[PDB]
Amino acid sequence: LGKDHEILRRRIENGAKELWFFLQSELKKLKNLEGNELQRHADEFLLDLGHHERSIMTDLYYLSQTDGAGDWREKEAKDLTELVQRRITYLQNPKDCSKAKKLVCNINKGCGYGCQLHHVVYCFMIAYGTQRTLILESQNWRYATGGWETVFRPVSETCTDRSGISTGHWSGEVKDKNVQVVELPIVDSLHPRPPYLPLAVPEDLADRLVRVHGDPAVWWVSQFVKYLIRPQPWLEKEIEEATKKLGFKHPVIGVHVRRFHPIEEYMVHVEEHFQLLARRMQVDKKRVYLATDDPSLLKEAKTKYPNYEFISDNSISWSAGLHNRYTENSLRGVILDIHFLSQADFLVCTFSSQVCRVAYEIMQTLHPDASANFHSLDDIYYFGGQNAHNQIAIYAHQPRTADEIPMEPGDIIGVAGNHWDGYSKGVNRKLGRTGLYPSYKVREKIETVKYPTYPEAE
Amino acid sequence: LGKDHEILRRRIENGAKELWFFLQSELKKLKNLEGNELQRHADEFLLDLGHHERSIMTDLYYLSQTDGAGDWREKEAKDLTELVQRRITYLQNPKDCSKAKKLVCNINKGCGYGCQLHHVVYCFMIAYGTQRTLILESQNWRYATGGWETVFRPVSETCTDRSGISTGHWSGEVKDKNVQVVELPIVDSLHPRPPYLPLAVPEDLADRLVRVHGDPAVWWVSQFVKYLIRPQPWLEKEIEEATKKLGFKHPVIGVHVRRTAFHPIEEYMVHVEEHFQLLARRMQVDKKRVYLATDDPSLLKEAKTKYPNYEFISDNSISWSAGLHNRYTENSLRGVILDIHFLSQADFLVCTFSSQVCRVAYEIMQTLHPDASANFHSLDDIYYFGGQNAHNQIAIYAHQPRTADEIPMEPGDIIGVAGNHWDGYSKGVNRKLGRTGLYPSYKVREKIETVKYPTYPEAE
């Protein structure tokens, strides 16, 4: 046992105990107050509770790093991603492309870039589960009519055509067993649905992922996002150029405001996380990378928060003007916004937005475990077309109001979202009742699927 | 890293985060309430907070045990005890008693049993640090005039005689280097004071102690209590007989109510009930049992009627099991020994640490578990040893006072702690500023003190 590990564990334990002592005393005094004197004491109470709670979270962070734990998690998370990327590269590059089993995906889904990119991810994951090389068709792509390879590297180096003896639309893995080239439609009306969909994770990787990562579902999704967005050299140059031009530097918190939530809703979580980071590092300046579709928000945020340095992409052209002809005008902004949001140390946004979801997923590829480096103002993490997200009640709950649902340990709860107020909303599937329940009284139900493991990739 | 260790660490982290969400939401609702709506909401707020807080503590307990941590902590605590007890046994049993350096302690201090036992402990710790065999003088002991050896084993098997070529009262370890037999007085007016006193721990054990125990100071004190209270075979049979006669079984919480400051029984039982609610999260509590030791003869009846679901066990004996032993021990010694025993054997201790008896029980409790430093709640004082050196802390987070009763602090300020008010604030002196007042208990860290004790390597 590590000495620092035990010191930190006891201070976390005693810190939470002193917090319980503090809460009982101040709440007792709070009961004998009225009116304006009650307002001040409650506000001072909350300010004192914030620093106390952040000291517990700080010791918890030190605990996750102490006695070689941080180095092991970086090493283990690096081996897991290198294993998956090697499996994907092996699948994507068969020796003879003319006799390879293939799955065809068309990027031209009737939606925006964030939704279109998630379409190819859902394509890629199903291709991975069916042992089919992913062939991406992207002619007349709305963001770059030259195709996908105009911006990113091709999804394969040896097999990029759709030649084969037989071709058919998706109708089932067993039914399409002897169909060489299977065309996959959008997830909206896919039938039959294979098991190779979020939020399940590969059964052969589940034990190692749960040990290393707080949300293995996003990590699995992120491995296909990571492979897809391997940039062409010109784009890699542009990204490095924008980093120098914009002065993107750490520490920095990414904020994505899609437009309704005022800027103050986003900033109260930015200010709170900067106070947390200040407990364990020097914060030279509070930096926020602002990505928004509201052009009047940048000047609103700068004047409302004069002690914050706001970094944002306002360019009307690529660094090299030659690239303006091959990419649609709005592709530059979304690629840069998603990049810098994914590079940030913390992400404040709304997970109902595809753009923040993509940035959150890429963030998981840049750190051993960045599952908690976010705060969404509405939805929890999800993937379009995922199977049902279920939780398991660990502690009993008896409803206080009619809006709450009862829970017994072992009950399967289908969560709709987290209200970030101590309660979550969902359906108790054992009863068919939908309502609120304490968020701490449930745990996540991690699903697994028997994927191919591709032993030849070694 | 172990999988359960990582799952528990995250659930503790996420459980604390959801607690912060819950606190922010409900406190914002409380700001817009009046009268009975405010009272009823806060009470339901407290009830929800308690269960939520106990789930975090429960996960923290599981964290302390996962992936072989519990078994390792037990074997390491066992090795540290057997090492110290070997060193004490080696010192106390020299081959040639006539030539051995000695320290003479007289048990007949003008105070009660708890105070007298701690006097010998303070003797034994100094004798350990000065490499002198402890010679215990206990004739006309007010609890057993036949001597200390009437109840417990003698402190030595080979050297209980006080012969030496020279003798003198304590005048300092340097001046007494050639005084073979040194008489040590009470700690009250001891001059000069040696470094072998609480709350410092031996520096050769300090690293392993901090790694394994939450309060190494009590553990170091408990080693000398453990060696002294080695019972004679008849006392060992009495304790075994009283255990069966009282029905003492686990789980059980020890409660000591000394009333000769007054605390109502509810002041103790709120922490008794809270700890049983905690234990009910990780074990099936067949019955809420309490061992009650008190100097108030009417309290046992009061506790039974006010808490009908509790099984109250207490010492009520008028004599030993074997009546022969009544003739050699004073009547009150039986109750104190049995109370200290069963309080120390309890899974949790609720009392007032200003009472010597509860402190003795808390110290002995440390010899019964790997780390029982947190298995208590005192209604007043924090732990202390009579005559200890200044108990200091180190401020780790800055504090700006809100009221005139608070003191400011900066990281690194040595804080002399006077006590913990158990309301989030402690009371002490900022020695840098010379100011005394309140400060948040979580903003300071314990300052562990070390002393170069002899290590007695020949004892291996």
From Swiss-Prot, chain A:
Organism: Homo sapiens
Pathway: Protein modification; protein glycosylation
Topology class, membrane: Single-pass type II membrane protein
Catalysed transformations (reactions): N(4)-{beta-D-GlcNAc-(1->2)-alpha-D-Man-(1->3)-[beta-D-GlcNAc-(1->2)-alpha-D-Man-(1->6)]-beta-D-Man-(1->4)-beta-D-GlcNAc-(1->4)-beta-D-GlcNAc}-L-asparaginyl-[protein] + GDP-beta-L-fucose = an N(4)-{beta-D-GlcNAc-(1->2)-alpha-D-Man-(1->3)-[beta-D-GlcNAc-(1->2)-alpha-D-Man-(1->6)]-beta-D-Man-(1->4)-beta-D-GlcNAc-(1->4)-[alpha-L-Fuc-(1->6)]-beta-D-GlcNAc}-L-asparaginyl-[protein] + GDP + H(+)
Annotated region described as Important for donor substrate binding, given as residue ranges: 258-259
Main subcellular localisation: Golgi
EC number(s) reported in the record: 2.4.1.68
Disease linkage: Congenital disorder of glycosylation with defective fucosylation 1: A form of congenital disorder of glycosylation, a genetically heterogeneous group of multisystem disorders caused by a defect in glycoprotein biosynthesis and characterized by under-glycosylated serum glycoproteins. Congenital disorders of glycosylation result in a wide variety of clinical features, such as defects in the nervous system development, psychomotor retardation, dysmorphic features, hypotonia, coagulation disorders, and immunodeficiency.
Effect of Y266A: Loss of enzyme activity
Family to which this protein belongs: Belongs to the glycosyltransferase 23 family.
Gene that specifies this protein: FUT8
Stated consequence of mutating D294A: No effect on enzyme activity
Description of post-translational modifications: Tyrosine phosphorylated by PKDCC/VLK.
Protein's recorded name: Alpha-(1,6)-fucosyltransferase
Annotated GO biological process: fibroblast migration; GDP-L-fucose metabolic process; in utero embryonic development; integrin-mediated signaling pathway; L-fucose catabolic process; N-glycan fucosylation; N-glycan processing; oligosaccharide biosynthetic process
Keyword Metal-binding annotated: no
GO cellular component, one term: extracellular exosome
Ranges per topology, Lumenal: 1-458
Disulfide-bonded cysteines: C97-C159, C105-C123, C111-C115, C349-C356
EC main group: transferase
Localization of this protein: Golgi apparatus, Golgi stack membrane
Keywords: Congenital disorder of glycosylation, Disease variant, Disulfide bond, Glycosyltransferase, Golgi apparatus, Membrane, Phosphoprotein, SH3 domain, SH3-binding, Signal-anchor, Transferase, Transmembrane, Transmembrane helix
Phenotype for R230G: In CDGF1; drastic decrease of protein level in patient's fibroblasts and complete loss of total core fucosylated N-glycans in serum and fibroblasts compared to controls
Modified residues annotated as Phosphoserine in this record: S171
One Gene Ontology term of the molecular function aspect: alpha-(1->6)-fucosyltransferase activity
Placement of sequence motif SH3-binding: 192-198
Stated role: Catalyzes the addition of fucose in alpha 1-6 linkage to the first GlcNAc residue, next to the peptide chains in N-glycans.
